[PDB]
Amino acid sequence: REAQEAGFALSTNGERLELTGPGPVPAELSARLEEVTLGSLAASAELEV
Amino acid sequence: IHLAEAVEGLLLEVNRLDELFRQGSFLREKTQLEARFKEAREQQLEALR
Amino acid sequence: ALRRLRRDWALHYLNNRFEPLFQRFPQARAYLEALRARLARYAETGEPLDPAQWRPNLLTSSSSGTPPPIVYEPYATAPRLFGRLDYLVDRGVWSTN
Structure determined via? cryo-EM
Contact (CB<8Å) B27/A31: yes
Contact (CB<8Å) B17/C43: yes
CA atoms within 13 A on the CB side of C33: 7
- What Å distances lie between residue C71 and A45, B39, C40, C76, C77, CA to CA? 49, 70, 41, 11, 14
CA atoms within 13 A on the CB side of C26: 1
| Degrees to nearest 5, angle at CA A8 with A38 and A12 | 45
Task: Provide the Cα torsion C53, C59, C64, C69; round to 10°.
Answer: -170
Residue C67: asked if its preceding bond is cis (omega within 30°), the reply is yes
Contact (CB<8Å) B33/C10: no
CB-CB: which of B18, B22, B31 is closest to A30? B31
Is residue C10 within 8 A of residue C43, CB to CB? The reply is yes
